[PDB]
Amino acid sequence: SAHCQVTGRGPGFGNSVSHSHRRTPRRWDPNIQNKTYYLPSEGRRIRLRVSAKGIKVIDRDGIEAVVARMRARGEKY
Amino acid sequence: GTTPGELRELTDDELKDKLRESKEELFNLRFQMATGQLSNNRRLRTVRQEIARVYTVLRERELG
């Protein structure tokens, strides 16, 4: 995928099941979405690819904080 | 017949004088060599070397 942006919750690769096994993965994706937000600092609307988890992070942490944390990682937002 | 310390007395424009002269000599030698009017083949080598020395001295004087 375009890859998460605030955390880095990438995929994973499972395998087997019950009822006798069979070996066979099925990526365990993450739940990213395309929520947008508003930066009152620079007067702008930003769209991101963020999981619901990361939305939780935002609403109990801020957006400025998050973009600074992403600036660190230098994601091409 | 020259050497580097001998040439390093000469300023630039003198070096270019000798440079152009030696190229004229090399040209006339190549025509003589084709025609068969040449025996002392080695003058080609000597001239080629002298041209190299002169360019070398110029570059020394431009990187000094």
């Binding site: - | 440079l19 190229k23 090399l26 040209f27 190549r30 025509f31 003589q32 084709a34 025609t35 431009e62």
Partner: protein, 97 residues
């Protein structure tokens, strides 16, 4: 430094029956550098000999391919240039036939 000399392009004459039949009527064939061209050769010649060129030509030659105990070698290509001096008509002395 670098100094454009015209005498580094023109490499050598040509010596053969065709060339001499041309010289009998004032056409001279030289061997040049492959990356030359006609304006460059014209300028080189009507500088070197201070004589009045009016038309120039060219040609390319793909070198021969000889054999050896080793195997299949190959000589070098060239570029032959052919000059028709105008009515000025001072023949090129340094040629030496």
């Amino acid at each position: 430094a670098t100094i454009t000399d015209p005498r580094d392009i023109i490499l050598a004459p040509v010596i053969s029956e065709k060339s001499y039949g041309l010289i009998e009527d004032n056409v001279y064939t030289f061997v040049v550098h492959p990356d030359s061209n006609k304006t460059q050769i014209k300028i080189a010649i009507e500088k070197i000999f201070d004589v009045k060129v009016d038309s120039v030509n060219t040609a390319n030659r793909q070198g021969k391919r000889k054999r050896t105990r080793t195997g299949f070698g190959k000589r070098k290509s060239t570029k032959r240039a052919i000059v028709k001096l105008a009515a000025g008509s001072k023949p090129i002395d340094l040629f030496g036939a």
